Amino acid sequence: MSEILVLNCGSSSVKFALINPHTSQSLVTGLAENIATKNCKVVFKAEHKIVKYLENGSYKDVFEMLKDFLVENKHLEKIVAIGHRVVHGGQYFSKSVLINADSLEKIKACIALAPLHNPAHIEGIRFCQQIFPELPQVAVFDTAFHQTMPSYIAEYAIPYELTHKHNIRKYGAHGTSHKYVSEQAAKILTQQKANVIVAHLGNGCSITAVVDGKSIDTSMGLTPLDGLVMGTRSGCIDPSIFAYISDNLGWSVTEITNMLNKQSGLLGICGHNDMREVSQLAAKGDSLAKLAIEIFSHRVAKFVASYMIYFNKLDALVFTGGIGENAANIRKNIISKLANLGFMIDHQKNSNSETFINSKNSHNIMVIATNEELMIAQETQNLI
Amino acid sequence: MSEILVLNCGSSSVKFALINPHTSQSLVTGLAENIATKNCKVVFKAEHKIVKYLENGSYKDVFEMLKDFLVENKHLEKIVAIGHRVVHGGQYFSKSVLINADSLEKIKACIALAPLHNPAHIEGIRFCQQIFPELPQVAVFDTAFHQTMPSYIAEYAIPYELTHKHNIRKYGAHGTSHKYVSEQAAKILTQQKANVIVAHLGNGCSITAVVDGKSIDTSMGLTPLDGLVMGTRSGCIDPSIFAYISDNLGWSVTEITNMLNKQSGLLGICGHNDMREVSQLAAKGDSLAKLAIEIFSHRVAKFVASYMIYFNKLDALVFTGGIGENAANIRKNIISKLANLGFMIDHQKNSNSETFINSKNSHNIMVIATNEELMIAQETQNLI
């Protein structure tokens, strides 16, 4: 009957789920958003949906409302631990860990590496210590899975001292998703270990080569900004743009970096960050939306192609994430761009988002739902 | 019997060659260095090498000395035109052009794209207008060849206004070498234009996908900093490194960019920028030199793999440039990493850098010497 409270704390949002690790069931899921604004609200999804508005609600208010809900609905007594999604564990963590003085010190040190992510994770952990004092807590790092990437792949071609004294290298992210999905792939294919390429396509997008079950290369970088085109993130770009923009427009590094993270990607190209809206606009003939789809899909194809280098035999190309799981048109586009590499879609299977969507003469092409919350619950249960 | 004078006019240097476009023969080559300093000197290489020192010689003094040499050795009368290398032609130039007020205006508008070179190119042209008034002049752009890249490939995923108002996109470079080499490959391979991937590996390194003789994708970006690992340039790196260094170490955009351009690449990794010295050190057992070679070679292999998407049938992978033409160990290492993609080297053919260096069961792998000065002479001849 034990449950794990799973959290993903963001700058103005808290995503939560109550999961039974023994049954793998998600009993309650929810999302607080627009925190610290007049539009603050918390959506609870249990048997039925309940939306609770809290004008000007703070992060602490949100946690108190979450606790109130757990108490009133008699979940608090069943909860044995809290698992936190933490984006960046730097070179410190290659697996999940209990939250205590040491791990917290390290998570704090990694703020430098993921300044747009780790502060909120830590704030969440602190609220939980205050509000659920007697529960053990676990951190599950989106960089952990990628810690197996070898130096010749992960390191950049920069001064030794920057690499080693300042820990600058490729870390990747979405690790929990890539781990969960690649393990699911091996299970479905009845393999002990997966040899797959996993494309996690959602608001953020990344892709990872998994060889014998371990990440060997991945698209995000020092931070989740790098690699694929995303909702508001640029992904790959010539570092020369900093000097160019600074010299010519006078923007600061902070301003340029904010633009790459918040005003770029699909949003920058066509004016919409939501791929669903972009698809609908493109279908109606919007030229920029159509272009955004081409740039997005072509870059995914280029990464898949590049990762073929790692495989004597590729078990499967796997789609996951909000877009990967649901957007048949995007999967079709990416696969059409991979025709020369022996990938081919079965349109009927694709339209239904089946587990396998490839035709007969093609590498396996799979659609697998990610479940980061369940993975976090399991990682957490393992440590208590 | 006619001759073309080929120039690369830099801020403190003039590289020159006298070429017969019809016989393809380079009659004289040379380099003026340290112009307007105590150590100003001009090297002339014809039958033998001659070094002429000219303490504090002006850029104008250099040109008069060049003229004097061409008069004294009876070359001047045979010269029919002057071809100028221009590093960046933006979106204005997709081919070589005769120099006139119009084209000069356009070149001037590209200054922001190459702020340290395009001015020196222009000044050199003006010196030539004064000193060789009778001769037609042609500009040949390192960026022109890549102007066939389609927008969904060349554009970054950034705000529309940055792309279009401010011309921020991938331009690539080494265009004159990629064009010349793919042209040579076409003469050797089949009846049609070449379908080849060209890896130009020298002090700068870039790789290009050429389909039916036209560039469709290439590794350098806005400037020649991006893409492959090079002697002192980082190539690809997470843009997030700017905020990290600026915020944590307090460096300026200029200092960070200088670091990526001048202290990175092989030099940054192992302490040596010259690939020959890196190879020699690695061969004696230096593990960092070995790592530098692994990082360098793997990145080339990743780009080759990524470019496979463009080809129904790849005609050849082609190595060129100072390293590509001469470094058998480096080519062997790169092809080694491409084993899963059906590339295999023949060691004895590789040892002599033969036209074909692949073994029996392999895509074609070639070594073709580049000759950018000849290409500039041919482009120039074509317009006069």
Side-chain angles (χ1 to χ4, degrees), chain A residues 157-216:
Chain A
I158 59 180
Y160 184 95
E161 173 161 295
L162 294 181
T163 296
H164 295 275
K165 180 176 176 175
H166 300 279
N167 305 301
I168 296 168
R169 72 197 289 112
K170 165 173 272 177
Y171 293 98
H174 288 155
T176 292
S177 185
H178 290 296
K179 181 172 196 270
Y180 174 86
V181 168
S182 62
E183 292 181 1
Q184 281 308 113
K187 292 177 185 190
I188 292 156
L189 301 166
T190 62
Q191 303 288 311
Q192 181 172 331
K193 299 292 189 181
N195 283 284
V196 299
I197 297 168
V198 177
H200 177 115
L201 307 182
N203 294 323
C205 297
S206 69
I207 179 176
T208 295
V210 177
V211 172
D212 294 335
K214 300 185 300 182
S215 172
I216 195 159

Side-chain angles (χ1 to χ4, degrees), chain B residues 124-200:
Chain B
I125 290 174
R126 285 161 181 174
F127 279 123
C128 284
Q129 292 184 327
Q130 295 187 319
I131 299 180
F132 311 106
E134 296 178 351
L135 295 178
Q137 309 192 236
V138 165
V140 181
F141 309 88
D142 294 344
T143 49
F145 188 57
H146 303 302
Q147 284 296 297
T148 48
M149 290 191 286
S151 294
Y152 74 95
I153 288 172
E155 288 184 17
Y156 298 122
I158 61 186
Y160 182 96
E161 181 163 83
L162 290 178
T163 298
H164 300 284
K165 184 174 176 178
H166 300 107
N167 304 304
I168 301 170
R169 63 196 290 117
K170 174 178 277 191
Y171 295 97
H174 284 154
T176 297
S177 172
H178 290 296
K179 188 170 190 265
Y180 174 84
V181 167
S182 59
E183 287 185 0
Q184 294 301 128
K187 296 185 203 169
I188 303 168
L189 281 162
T190 73
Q191 178 184 354
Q192 297 71 237
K193 293 317 178 197
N195 295 300
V196 291
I197 295 166
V198 178
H200 178 113

Side-chain angles (χ1 to χ4, degrees), chain B residues 205-244:
Chain B
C205 297
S206 74
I207 181 168
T208 296
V210 174
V211 177
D212 201 29
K214 298 177 177 206
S215 175
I216 192 170
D217 201 351
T218 191
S219 68
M220 284 165 166
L222 183 72
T223 81
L225 173 62
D226 206 8
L228 297 184
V229 176
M230 324 188 195
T232 72
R233 293 169 250 176
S234 66
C236 290
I237 190 163
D238 184 344
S240 306
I241 59 90
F242 280 79
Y244 181 87

Side-chain angles (χ1 to χ4, degrees), chain A residues 112-113 151-153 155-160 162 166 168 217 221-223 225-226 229 233-246 248-249 251 253-254 257 259-260 263-265 268-269 288 291 294-295 298-299 301-302 305-312 337-338 340-341, chain B residues 112-113 151-153 155-160 162 166 168 217 221-223 225-226 229 233-249 251 253 257 259-260 263-265 268-269 288 291 294-295 298-299 301-302 305-312 337-338 340-341:
Chain A
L113 296 169
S151 288
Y152 77 99
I153 291 170
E155 289 184 12
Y156 296 117
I158 59 180
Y160 184 95
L162 294 181
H166 300 279
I168 296 168
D217 197 351
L222 178 67
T223 80
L225 169 60
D226 210 7
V229 180
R233 283 165 266 176
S234 64
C236 294
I237 195 160
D238 182 348
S240 308
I241 61 112
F242 280 81
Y244 180 90
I245 284 169
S246 173
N248 295 283
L249 300 183
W251 300 13
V253 164
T254 297
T257 308
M259 173 275 296
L260 292 174
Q263 301 300 326
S264 296
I269 304 170
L288 290 176
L291 177 59
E294 294 305 299
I295 296 173
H298 177 79
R299 197 177 294 177
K302 279 183 66 184
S306 78
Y307 291 174
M308 298 298 286
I309 197 178
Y310 300 114
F311 300 97
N312 172 63
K337 297 183 157 52
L338 286 162
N340 284 330
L341 272 55
Chain B
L113 297 171
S151 294
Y152 74 95
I153 288 172
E155 288 184 17
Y156 298 122
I158 61 186
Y160 182 96
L162 290 178
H166 300 107
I168 301 170
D217 201 351
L222 183 72
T223 81
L225 173 62
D226 206 8
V229 176
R233 293 169 250 176
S234 66
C236 290
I237 190 163
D238 184 344
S240 306
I241 59 90
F242 280 79
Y244 181 87
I245 294 175
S246 171
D247 287 336
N248 296 283
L249 288 57
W251 296 13
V253 177
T257 300
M259 178 270 295
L260 291 169
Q263 301 297 327
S264 299
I269 302 164
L288 275 180
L291 180 60
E294 294 304 294
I295 297 173
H298 183 72
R299 187 168 309 168
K302 277 178 69 179
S306 88
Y307 290 178
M308 298 300 282
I309 62 167
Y310 302 114
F311 301 96
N312 179 62
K337 288 174 166 53
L338 287 162
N340 295 321
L341 275 59

Side-chain angles (χ1 to χ4, degrees), chain A residues 173-377:
Chain A
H174 288 155
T176 292
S177 185
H178 290 296
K179 181 172 196 270
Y180 174 86
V181 168
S182 62
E183 292 181 1
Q184 281 308 113
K187 292 177 185 190
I188 292 156
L189 301 166
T190 62
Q191 303 288 311
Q192 181 172 331
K193 299 292 189 181
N195 283 284
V196 299
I197 297 168
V198 177
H200 177 115
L201 307 182
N203 294 323
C205 297
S206 69
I207 179 176
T208 295
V210 177
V211 172
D212 294 335
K214 300 185 300 182
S215 172
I216 195 159
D217 197 351
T218 194
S219 64
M220 288 170 165
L222 178 67
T223 80
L225 169 60
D226 210 7
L228 300 179
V229 180
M230 316 186 200
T232 68
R233 283 165 266 176
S234 64
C236 294
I237 195 160
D238 182 348
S240 308
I241 61 112
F242 280 81
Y244 180 90
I245 284 169
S246 173
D247 291 355
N248 295 283
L249 300 183
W251 300 13
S252 74
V253 164
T254 297
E255 291 169 338
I256 299 162
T257 308
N258 176 255
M259 173 275 296
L260 292 174
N261 272 300
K262 295 303 189 297
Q263 301 300 326
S264 296
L266 300 178
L267 177 55
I269 304 170
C270 76
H272 303 266
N273 62 294
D274 170 19
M275 177 56 97
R276 289 170 294 175
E277 298 188 3
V278 182
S279 296
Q280 296 178 336
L281 284 180
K284 301 182 181 305
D286 187 78
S287 48
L288 290 176
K290 290 175 187 291
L291 177 59
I293 288 169
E294 294 305 299
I295 296 173
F296 178 104
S297 300
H298 177 79
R299 197 177 294 177
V300 178
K302 279 183 66 184
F303 269 81
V304 169
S306 78
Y307 291 174
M308 298 298 286
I309 197 178
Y310 300 114
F311 300 97
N312 172 63
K313 170 61 175 187
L314 177 65
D315 290 342
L317 169 62
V318 183
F319 287 105
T320 193
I323 296 170
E325 301 168 24
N326 300 291
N329 64 311
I330 301 301
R331 290 189 305 249
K332 172 178 177 173
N333 191 311
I334 292 165
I335 299 306
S336 179
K337 297 183 157 52
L338 286 162
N340 284 330
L341 272 55
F343 291 89
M344 297 287 311
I345 214 71
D346 176 303
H347 291 280
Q348 172 178 349
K349 298 175 175 183
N350 184 43
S351 76
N352 295 315
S353 296
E354 312 210 332
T355 301
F356 290 86
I357 62 173
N358 58 273
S359 66
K360 287 192 171 191
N361 302 331
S362 169
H363 300 287
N364 290 327
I365 302 166
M366 297 172 81
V367 177
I368 297 178
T370 188
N371 190 349
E372 291 148 305
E373 298 79 8
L374 175 61
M375 180 64 104
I376 293 176

